[PDB]
Amino acid sequence: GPRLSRLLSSAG
Amino acid sequence: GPLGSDLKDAEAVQKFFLEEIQLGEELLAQGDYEKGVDHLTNAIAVCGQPQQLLQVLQQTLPPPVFQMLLTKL
């Protein structure tokens, strides 16, 4: 799902 | 002036990175692996230290898709 993107953002 | 010398440059790249990650993960969530990875590799490409990003990706992506990703790195 598209909110998976929050995980990738948290990686920095 | 050259890219990076303007205050607005840092904002544009942070927005670009968010957009590319959101777009990539939406495309992946539709089954379009190739275009999704295109966008994910754009996001990585503007990231100065993408170690954890790559690690999460390799953790989370199907392995043939992660292979695709590396090809497009």
Side-chain angles (χ1 to χ4, degrees):
Chain A
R3 257 170 236 114
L4 204 44
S5 68
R6 292 192 191 178
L7 173 65
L8 305 181
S9 283
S10 79
Chain B
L3 208 131
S5 64
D6 192 296
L7 346 228
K8 283 178 278 287
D9 296 344
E11 317 213 1
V13 69
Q14 292 163 11
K15 283 191 278 276
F16 177 75
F17 176 90
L18 204 86
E19 292 153 8
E20 291 304 303
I21 290 292
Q22 290 173 5
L23 215 191
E25 288 290 3
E26 172 63 8
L27 258 24
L28 285 184
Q30 291 174 37
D32 194 339
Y33 295 154
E34 152 131 56
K35 289 300 311 133
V37 172
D38 279 340
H39 292 289
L40 267 34
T41 57
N42 292 333
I44 296 164
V46 303
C47 184
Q49 212 133 44
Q51 194 199 252
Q52 287 181 1
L53 179 52
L54 277 166
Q55 198 172 11
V56 171
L57 256 12
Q58 99 88 43
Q59 196 84 263
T60 63
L61 293 185
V65 180
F66 191 72
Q67 286 302 310
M68 263 204 120
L69 193 135
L70 297 174
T71 77
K72 300 177 167 201
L73 194 59

Coordinates of all heavy atoms in Angstrom, one line a residue:
Chain A
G1 N 0.8 -1.2 0.0 CA 0.0 0.0 0.0 C 0.9 1.3 0.0 O 2.0 1.2 0.5
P2 N 0.3 2.4 -0.5 CA 1.0 3.6 -0.7 C 1.6 4.3 0.6 O 2.5 5.1 0.5 CB 0.0 4.6 -1.4 CG -1.3 4.0 -1.0 CD -1.1 2.5 -1.0
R3 N 1.1 4.0 1.8 CA 1.6 4.5 3.1 C 2.9 3.7 3.6 O 3.5 4.1 4.6 CB 0.6 4.4 4.2 CG 0.0 5.8 4.4 CD -1.2 5.7 5.4 NE -2.3 6.3 4.7 CZ -3.4 5.7 4.3 NH1 -3.6 4.4 4.5 NH2 -4.3 6.4 3.7
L4 N 3.2 2.7 2.8 CA 4.5 2.0 3.0 C 5.6 3.1 2.8 O 6.6 3.0 3.5 CB 4.7 1.0 1.8 CG 5.7 -0.1 2.0 CD1 5.5 -0.7 3.4 CD2 5.4 -1.2 1.0
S5 N 5.3 4.1 2.0 CA 6.2 5.3 1.8 C 6.7 5.9 3.1 O 7.7 6.6 3.1 CB 5.5 6.3 0.9 OG 4.4 6.9 1.6
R6 N 5.9 5.8 4.2 CA 6.3 6.4 5.5 C 7.5 5.7 6.1 O 8.3 6.3 6.9 CB 5.1 6.4 6.5 CG 4.0 7.4 6.1 CD 3.0 7.6 7.3 NE 1.8 8.3 6.8 CZ 0.8 8.6 7.6 NH1 0.8 8.2 8.9 NH2 -0.3 9.2 7.1
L7 N 7.5 4.4 5.9 CA 8.6 3.6 6.3 C 9.9 4.0 5.6 O 11.0 4.2 6.2 CB 8.3 2.1 6.1 CG 9.4 1.0 6.3 CD1 9.8 0.9 7.8 CD2 8.9 -0.3 5.8
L8 N 9.8 4.2 4.3 CA 11.0 4.6 3.5 C 11.4 6.0 3.9 O 12.6 6.3 3.8 CB 10.7 4.5 2.0 CG 10.3 3.1 1.5 CD1 10.1 3.2 0.0 CD2 11.3 2.1 1.9
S9 N 10.5 6.9 4.2 CA 10.8 8.3 4.7 C 11.6 8.2 6.0 O 12.4 9.1 6.3 CB 9.6 9.1 4.9 OG 9.1 9.5 3.6
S10 N 11.2 7.3 6.9 CA 11.8 7.2 8.2 C 13.3 6.8 8.2 O 14.0 7.0 9.1 CB 11.0 6.3 9.1 OG 11.2 4.9 8.9
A11 N 13.6 6.1 7.1 CA 15.0 5.7 6.9 C 16.0 6.9 6.7 O 17.2 6.8 7.0 CB 15.1 4.7 5.7
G12 N 15.5 8.0 6.1 CA 16.3 9.2 5.9 C 17.4 9.0 4.9 O 17.3 8.1 4.0
Chain B
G1 N 22.1 31.1 -9.8 CA 23.5 30.4 -9.7 C 23.3 28.9 -9.8 O 22.2 28.3 -10.1
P2 N 24.5 28.1 -9.6 CA 24.5 26.7 -9.7 C 23.6 26.0 -8.7 O 23.2 26.6 -7.7 CB 26.0 26.3 -9.4 CG 26.7 27.6 -9.7 CD 25.8 28.7 -9.2
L3 N 23.2 24.7 -9.0 CA 22.2 24.0 -8.2 C 22.8 23.8 -6.8 O 23.9 23.4 -6.7 CB 21.8 22.7 -8.8 CG 20.4 22.2 -8.4 CD1 19.6 21.8 -9.6 CD2 20.5 21.1 -7.4
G4 N 22.0 24.1 -5.8 CA 22.4 23.9 -4.4 C 22.7 25.3 -3.7 O 22.8 25.3 -2.4
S5 N 22.8 26.3 -4.4 CA 23.2 27.6 -3.9 C 22.0 28.5 -3.4 O 22.2 29.5 -2.8 CB 24.1 28.4 -4.9 OG 23.3 28.7 -6.0
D6 N 20.8 28.0 -3.7 CA 19.6 28.7 -3.3 C 18.8 27.9 -2.2 O 18.8 26.7 -2.2 CB 18.7 28.8 -4.6 CG 17.5 29.7 -4.4 OD1 16.6 29.4 -3.5 OD2 17.4 30.8 -5.1
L7 N 18.2 28.7 -1.3 CA 17.5 28.1 -0.2 C 16.4 27.2 -0.7 O 16.2 26.1 -0.1 CB 16.8 29.3 0.6 CG 17.3 30.8 0.5 CD1 17.5 31.3 1.9 CD2 18.5 31.1 -0.4
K8 N 15.7 27.5 -1.8 CA 14.6 26.8 -2.4 C 15.1 25.4 -3.0 O 14.2 24.6 -3.3 CB 14.0 27.6 -3.6 CG 13.1 28.7 -3.1 CD 12.6 29.5 -4.3 CE 13.6 30.5 -4.8 NZ 13.7 31.7 -3.9
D9 N 16.4 25.2 -3.3 CA 16.9 24.0 -3.9 C 16.7 22.8 -2.9 O 16.2 21.8 -3.3 CB 18.4 24.2 -4.3 CG 18.5 25.2 -5.4 OD1 17.5 25.6 -6.1 OD2 19.7 25.7 -5.7
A10 N 17.0 23.0 -1.6 CA 16.9 22.0 -0.6 C 15.4 21.6 -0.4 O 15.1 20.4 -0.2 CB 17.5 22.4 0.7
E11 N 14.5 22.5 -0.5 CA 13.1 22.2 -0.4 C 12.6 21.4 -1.6 O 11.8 20.4 -1.4 CB 12.3 23.5 -0.3 CG 12.8 24.5 0.7 CD 11.8 25.4 1.4 OE1 10.6 25.1 1.1 OE2 12.1 26.3 2.2
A12 N 13.1 21.7 -2.8 CA 12.6 21.0 -4.0 C 13.0 19.6 -4.0 O 12.3 18.7 -4.4 CB 13.2 21.7 -5.3
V13 N 14.2 19.3 -3.6 CA 14.7 17.9 -3.5 C 14.1 17.1 -2.4 O 13.8 15.9 -2.6 CB 16.3 17.9 -3.4 CG1 16.8 18.4 -2.1 CG2 16.8 16.4 -3.6
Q14 N 13.8 17.7 -1.3 CA 13.0 17.0 -0.2 C 11.6 16.6 -0.7 O 11.1 15.5 -0.5 CB 12.9 17.8 1.1 CG 14.3 17.9 1.8 CD 14.2 19.1 2.9 OE1 13.2 19.6 3.2 NE2 15.4 19.4 3.4
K15 N 11.0 17.6 -1.4 CA 9.7 17.3 -2.0 C 9.8 16.3 -3.1 O 8.9 15.4 -3.3 CB 9.1 18.6 -2.6 CG 8.4 19.5 -1.6 CD 7.6 20.6 -2.2 CE 8.5 21.7 -2.7 NZ 8.8 22.6 -1.5
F16 N 10.8 16.3 -3.9 CA 11.0 15.4 -5.0 C 11.2 14.0 -4.5 O 10.6 13.0 -5.0 CB 12.3 15.8 -5.9 CG 12.6 14.8 -6.9 CD1 11.8 14.7 -8.1 CD2 13.6 13.9 -6.8 CE1 12.1 13.8 -9.1 CE2 13.9 13.0 -7.8 CZ 13.2 12.9 -8.9
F17 N 12.0 13.8 -3.4 CA 12.2 12.5 -2.8 C 10.9 11.9 -2.2 O 10.7 10.8 -2.4 CB 13.3 12.7 -1.7 CG 13.5 11.5 -0.9 CD1 14.5 10.6 -1.2 CD2 12.8 11.2 0.3 CE1 14.8 9.4 -0.5 CE2 13.0 10.0 1.1 CZ 14.0 9.1 0.7
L18 N 10.1 12.7 -1.5 CA 8.9 12.2 -1.0 C 7.9 11.8 -2.1 O 7.4 10.7 -2.1 CB 8.2 13.3 -0.1 CG 7.2 12.8 1.0 CD1 8.0 12.5 2.3 CD2 6.2 13.9 1.3
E19 N 7.8 12.6 -3.1 CA 7.0 12.3 -4.3 C 7.4 11.0 -5.0 O 6.5 10.2 -5.3 CB 7.1 13.4 -5.4 CG 6.4 14.8 -5.0 CD 7.1 16.0 -5.6 OE1 7.9 15.8 -6.5 OE2 6.7 17.1 -5.2
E20 N 8.7 10.8 -5.1 CA 9.2 9.6 -5.8 C 9.0 8.4 -5.0 O 8.7 7.3 -5.6 CB 10.7 9.8 -6.2 CG 11.0 10.9 -7.2 CD 10.2 10.7 -8.5 OE1 10.4 9.6 -9.2 OE2 9.4 11.6 -9.0
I21 N 9.2 8.5 -3.7 CA 8.9 7.3 -2.8 C 7.4 6.9 -2.8 O 7.1 5.8 -2.9 CB 9.4 7.6 -1.4 CG1 11.0 7.5 -1.4 CG2 8.8 6.6 -0.4 CD1 11.6 6.2 -1.6
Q22 N 6.6 8.0 -2.7 CA 5.1 7.8 -2.7 C 4.6 7.2 -4.0 O 3.8 6.2 -4.0 CB 4.4 9.1 -2.4 CG 4.5 9.6 -1.0 CD 3.9 11.0 -0.8 OE1 3.3 11.6 -1.7 NE2 4.1 11.5 0.4
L23 N 5.2 7.7 -5.1 CA 4.8 7.2 -6.4 C 5.3 5.8 -6.7 O 4.6 5.0 -7.2 CB 5.4 8.1 -7.5 CG 4.6 8.4 -8.8 CD1 5.5 9.1 -9.8 CD2 4.0 7.2 -9.4
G24 N 6.5 5.5 -6.3 CA 7.1 4.2 -6.4 C 6.3 3.2 -5.7 O 6.0 2.1 -6.3
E25 N 6.0 3.5 -4.4 CA 5.3 2.5 -3.6 C 3.8 2.3 -4.0 O 3.3 1.2 -3.8 CB 5.4 2.9 -2.1 CG 6.8 2.7 -1.4 CD 7.2 1.2 -1.3 OE1 6.4 0.3 -1.7 OE2 8.3 0.9 -0.7
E26 N 3.2 3.4 -4.5 CA 1.9 3.2 -5.1 C 1.9 2.3 -6.4 O 1.1 1.4 -6.5 CB 1.3 4.6 -5.5 CG 0.0 4.6 -6.3 CD -1.2 3.9 -5.6 OE1 -1.2 3.6 -4.4 OE2 -2.3 3.8 -6.3
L27 N 2.9 2.5 -7.3 CA 3.1 1.7 -8.4 C 3.4 0.3 -8.1 O 2.8 -0.7 -8.7 CB 4.2 2.3 -9.3 CG 3.9 3.1 -10.6 CD1 2.5 3.7 -10.6 CD2 5.0 4.1 -10.8
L28 N 4.2 0.0 -7.1 CA 4.5 -1.3 -6.6 C 3.2 -1.9 -6.0 O 3.0 -3.1 -6.2 CB 5.5 -1.3 -5.5 CG 7.0 -1.1 -5.8 CD1 7.8 -1.2 -4.5 CD2 7.5 -2.1 -6.8
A29 N 2.4 -1.1 -5.4 CA 1.1 -1.6 -4.8 C 0.1 -1.9 -5.9 O -0.9 -2.5 -5.6 CB 0.6 -0.6 -3.8
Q30 N 0.3 -1.5 -7.1 CA -0.5 -1.8 -8.3 C 0.0 -3.0 -9.0 O -0.7 -3.6 -9.9 CB -0.7 -0.7 -9.2 CG -1.5 0.5 -8.6 CD -1.5 1.7 -9.6 OE1 -1.6 1.5 -10.8 NE2 -1.5 2.9 -9.0
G31 N 1.3 -3.4 -8.8 CA 1.9 -4.5 -9.5 C 2.9 -4.1 -10.6 O 3.5 -4.9 -11.3
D32 N 3.0 -2.7 -10.8 CA 4.0 -2.2 -11.8 C 5.3 -2.1 -11.2 O 5.7 -1.0 -10.7 CB 3.5 -0.9 -12.4 CG 4.2 -0.5 -13.7 OD1 5.3 -0.9 -13.9 OD2 3.7 0.3 -14.4
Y33 N 6.1 -3.2 -11.1 CA 7.4 -3.3 -10.5 C 8.4 -2.4 -11.2 O 9.2 -1.7 -10.5 CB 7.9 -4.7 -10.4 CG 7.1 -5.7 -9.6 CD1 7.1 -7.1 -9.8 CD2 6.3 -5.2 -8.5 CE1 6.3 -7.9 -9.1 CE2 5.6 -6.1 -7.7 CZ 5.6 -7.5 -8.0 OH 4.9 -8.3 -7.2
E34 N 8.4 -2.4 -12.5 CA 9.4 -1.7 -13.3 C 9.4 -0.2 -13.1 O 10.5 0.4 -12.9 CB 9.3 -2.1 -14.7 CG 9.8 -1.1 -15.7 CD 10.8 -1.6 -16.8 OE1 10.4 -2.6 -17.5 OE2 11.9 -1.1 -16.9
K35 N 8.2 0.4 -13.2 CA 8.0 1.8 -13.1 C 8.2 2.3 -11.7 O 8.7 3.3 -11.4 CB 6.7 2.2 -13.7 CG 6.5 2.2 -15.2 CD 7.5 3.1 -15.9 CE 7.5 4.5 -15.3 NZ 8.9 5.0 -15.1
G36 N 7.7 1.4 -10.7 CA 7.8 1.6 -9.3 C 9.3 1.7 -8.9 O 9.7 2.7 -8.2
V37 N 10.1 0.8 -9.4 CA 11.5 0.8 -9.1 C 12.3 2.0 -9.8 O 13.2 2.6 -9.2 CB 12.2 -0.6 -9.4 CG1 13.7 -0.5 -9.3 CG2 11.7 -1.6 -8.5
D38 N 11.9 2.3 -11.0 CA 12.3 3.6 -11.6 C 12.2 4.8 -10.6 O 13.2 5.5 -10.4 CB 11.5 3.9 -12.9 CG 12.0 3.2 -14.1 OD1 13.2 2.7 -14.1 OD2 11.2 3.1 -15.1
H39 N 11.1 4.9 -10.0 CA 10.8 6.0 -9.1 C 11.6 5.9 -7.7 O 12.2 6.9 -7.3 CB 9.3 6.3 -8.8 CG 8.7 6.8 -10.1 ND1 8.9 8.1 -10.5 CD2 7.8 6.2 -10.9 CE1 8.2 8.3 -11.6 NE2 7.6 7.1 -11.9
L40 N 11.6 4.7 -7.2 CA 12.5 4.4 -6.0 C 14.0 4.7 -6.3 O 14.7 5.2 -5.5 CB 12.3 2.9 -5.6 CG 11.2 2.5 -4.6 CD1 10.0 3.4 -4.5 CD2 10.9 1.0 -4.7
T41 N 14.4 4.3 -7.5 CA 15.9 4.6 -7.8 C 16.2 6.1 -8.0 O 17.3 6.5 -7.6 CB 16.5 3.8 -8.9 OG1 15.7 3.9 -10.1 CG2 16.5 2.3 -8.4
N42 N 15.1 6.9 -8.4 CA 15.3 8.3 -8.4 C 15.4 8.9 -7.0 O 16.2 9.8 -6.8 CB 14.1 9.0 -9.1 CG 14.0 8.7 -10.6 OD1 15.0 8.5 -11.3 ND2 12.8 8.8 -11.2
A43 N 14.6 8.4 -6.1 CA 14.6 8.8 -4.7 C 16.0 8.5 -4.1 O 16.6 9.4 -3.5 CB 13.5 8.1 -3.9
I44 N 16.4 7.3 -4.2 CA 17.8 6.9 -3.7 C 18.9 7.8 -4.3 O 19.8 8.3 -3.6 CB 18.1 5.4 -4.1 CG1 17.2 4.5 -3.3 CG2 19.6 5.1 -3.8 CD1 17.2 3.0 -3.9
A45 N 18.7 8.2 -5.6 CA 19.7 8.9 -6.3 C 20.0 10.3 -5.8 O 21.0 10.9 -6.1 CB 19.4 8.9 -7.8
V46 N 19.0 10.9 -5.1 CA 19.1 12.3 -4.6 C 19.5 12.3 -3.1 O 19.6 13.3 -2.5 CB 17.9 13.2 -4.8 CG1 17.5 13.2 -6.3 CG2 16.7 12.7 -4.0
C47 N 19.6 11.1 -2.6 CA 19.8 10.9 -1.1 C 21.3 10.7 -0.9 O 21.9 9.9 -1.6 CB 19.0 9.6 -0.7 SG 19.0 9.2 1.1
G48 N 21.9 11.6 -0.1 CA 23.3 11.6 0.1 C 23.8 10.4 0.9 O 25.0 10.0 0.7
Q49 N 23.0 9.9 1.8 CA 23.4 8.7 2.6 C 22.2 7.7 2.6 O 21.4 7.7 3.6 CB 23.8 9.1 4.0 CG 24.9 8.2 4.6 CD 26.0 9.0 5.3 OE1 25.8 10.0 6.0 NE2 27.2 8.5 5.1
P50 N 22.1 6.9 1.5 CA 20.9 6.0 1.4 C 21.1 4.6 1.9 O 20.4 3.7 1.5 CB 20.8 5.9 -0.2 CG 22.2 6.0 -0.6 CD 23.0 6.8 0.4
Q51 N 22.0 4.4 2.9 CA 22.3 3.1 3.5 C 21.1 2.4 4.1 O 20.7 1.3 3.7 CB 23.4 3.3 4.6 CG 24.0 2.0 5.1 CD 24.6 2.2 6.4 OE1 25.9 2.2 6.5 NE2 23.8 2.4 7.5
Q52 N 20.4 3.1 5.0 CA 19.2 2.6 5.7 C 18.0 2.4 4.7 O 17.3 1.4 4.7 CB 18.8 3.4 6.9 CG 19.6 3.2 8.1 CD 19.1 4.1 9.2 OE1 18.1 4.8 9.1 NE2 19.8 4.0 10.4
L53 N 17.9 3.4 3.8 CA 16.9 3.3 2.7 C 17.1 2.0 1.9 O 16.1 1.3 1.7 CB 16.9 4.5 1.8 CG 15.9 4.5 0.6 CD1 14.5 4.3 1.1 CD2 16.0 5.9 -0.1
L54 N 18.3 1.8 1.4 CA 18.6 0.6 0.7 C 18.3 -0.7 1.5 O 17.8 -1.7 1.0 CB 20.0 0.5 0.2 CG 20.3 1.3 -1.1 CD1 21.8 1.5 -1.3 CD2 19.7 0.5 -2.3
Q55 N 18.7 -0.6 2.8 CA 18.6 -1.8 3.7 C 17.1 -2.1 3.9 O 16.8 -3.3 3.8 CB 19.2 -1.5 5.0 CG 19.5 -2.7 5.9 CD 20.3 -2.4 7.1 OE1 20.5 -1.2 7.4 NE2 20.7 -3.4 7.8
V56 N 16.3 -1.1 4.1 CA 14.8 -1.4 4.2 C 14.2 -2.0 3.0 O 13.4 -2.9 3.1 CB 14.1 -0.1 4.7 CG1 12.6 -0.3 4.6 CG2 14.5 0.3 6.1
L57 N 14.6 -1.4 1.8 CA 14.2 -1.9 0.5 C 14.5 -3.3 0.3 O 13.7 -4.1 -0.2 CB 14.8 -1.0 -0.5 CG 14.1 0.1 -1.3 CD1 12.7 0.6 -0.8 CD2 15.0 1.3 -1.5
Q58 N 15.7 -3.7 0.6 CA 16.2 -5.1 0.3 C 15.6 -6.0 1.3 O 15.4 -7.2 1.0 CB 17.7 -5.1 0.4 CG 18.4 -5.6 1.6 CD 18.6 -7.1 1.6 OE1 18.9 -7.7 0.6 NE2 18.2 -7.7 2.8
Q59 N 15.2 -5.5 2.5 CA 14.5 -6.2 3.5 C 13.1 -6.5 3.0 O 12.6 -7.6 3.1 CB 14.4 -5.3 4.8 CG 14.0 -6.0 6.0 CD 15.1 -6.7 6.7 OE1 15.3 -7.9 6.6 NE2 15.9 -5.9 7.5
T60 N 12.4 -5.4 2.4 CA 11.0 -5.5 2.1 C 10.6 -5.9 0.7 O 9.5 -6.4 0.5 CB 10.3 -4.1 2.4 OG1 10.8 -3.1 1.6 CG2 10.4 -3.8 3.9
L61 N 11.4 -5.7 -0.3 CA 11.0 -6.0 -1.7 C 11.2 -7.5 -2.0 O 12.1 -8.1 -1.5 CB 11.9 -5.2 -2.7 CG 11.7 -3.6 -2.7 CD1 12.5 -3.0 -3.9 CD2 10.3 -3.2 -2.9
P62 N 10.3 -8.0 -2.9 CA 10.6 -9.3 -3.4 C 12.0 -9.4 -4.0 O 12.5 -8.4 -4.6 CB 9.6 -9.5 -4.5 CG 8.5 -8.5 -4.2 CD 9.2 -7.4 -3.6
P63 N 12.7 -10.5 -3.9 CA 14.1 -10.5 -4.3 C 14.3 -10.2 -5.8 O 15.4 -9.7 -6.2 CB 14.7 -11.8 -3.8 CG 13.8 -12.2 -2.7 CD 12.4 -11.8 -3.2
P64 N 13.4 -10.7 -6.7 CA 13.7 -10.3 -8.1 C 13.5 -8.9 -8.4 O 14.0 -8.3 -9.4 CB 12.6 -11.1 -8.9 CG 12.2 -12.2 -8.0 CD 12.2 -11.6 -6.6
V65 N 12.7 -8.2 -7.6 CA 12.4 -6.8 -7.7 C 13.6 -6.0 -7.1 O 14.0 -5.1 -7.7 CB 11.0 -6.4 -7.1 CG1 10.8 -4.9 -7.2 CG2 9.9 -7.2 -7.7
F66 N 14.1 -6.5 -6.0 CA 15.3 -5.9 -5.5 C 16.4 -6.0 -6.6 O 17.2 -5.0 -6.7 CB 15.7 -6.3 -4.2 CG 16.8 -5.5 -3.6 CD1 16.5 -4.2 -3.1 CD2 18.1 -6.0 -3.6 CE1 17.5 -3.4 -2.6 CE2 19.1 -5.2 -3.1 CZ 18.8 -3.9 -2.6
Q67 N 16.5 -7.1 -7.3 CA 17.5 -7.3 -8.3 C 17.3 -6.3 -9.4 O 18.3 -5.6 -9.8 CB 17.5 -8.7 -8.9 CG 18.1 -9.7 -8.0 CD 19.5 -9.4 -7.6 OE1 20.3 -9.1 -8.5 NE2 19.8 -9.4 -6.3
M68 N 16.1 -6.1 -9.9 CA 15.7 -5.0 -10.8 C 16.2 -3.7 -10.3 O 16.9 -2.9 -11.0 CB 14.2 -4.9 -10.9 CG 13.6 -5.6 -12.1 SD 12.0 -4.8 -12.4 CE 12.3 -4.2 -14.1
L69 N 16.0 -3.4 -9.0 CA 16.4 -2.2 -8.4 C 17.9 -1.9 -8.6 O 18.2 -0.8 -9.1 CB 16.0 -2.1 -6.9 CG 16.1 -0.7 -6.3 CD1 14.8 -0.4 -5.4 CD2 17.3 -0.6 -5.5
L70 N 18.7 -2.9 -8.2 CA 20.1 -2.8 -8.4 C 20.5 -2.5 -9.8 O 21.4 -1.6 -10.0 CB 20.8 -4.1 -7.8 CG 20.7 -4.3 -6.3 CD1 21.3 -5.7 -6.0 CD2 21.3 -3.2 -5.5
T71 N 19.9 -3.2 -10.8 CA 20.2 -2.9 -12.2 C 19.9 -1.5 -12.5 O 20.6 -0.9 -13.4 CB 19.4 -3.9 -13.2 OG1 18.0 -3.5 -13.3 CG2 19.5 -5.3 -12.8
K72 N 19.0 -0.8 -11.8 CA 18.6 0.6 -12.2 C 19.3 1.6 -11.2 O 19.0 2.8 -11.3 CB 17.1 0.7 -12.2 CG 16.4 -0.2 -13.2 CD 14.9 -0.1 -13.2 CE 14.3 -0.7 -14.4 NZ 12.9 -0.2 -14.6
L73 N 20.1 1.1 -10.3 CA 20.6 1.9 -9.2 C 21.4 3.1 -9.7 O 21.1 4.2 -9.2 CB 21.6 1.0 -8.4 CG 22.0 1.6 -7.0 CD1 20.8 1.8 -6.1 CD2 23.0 0.6 -6.4

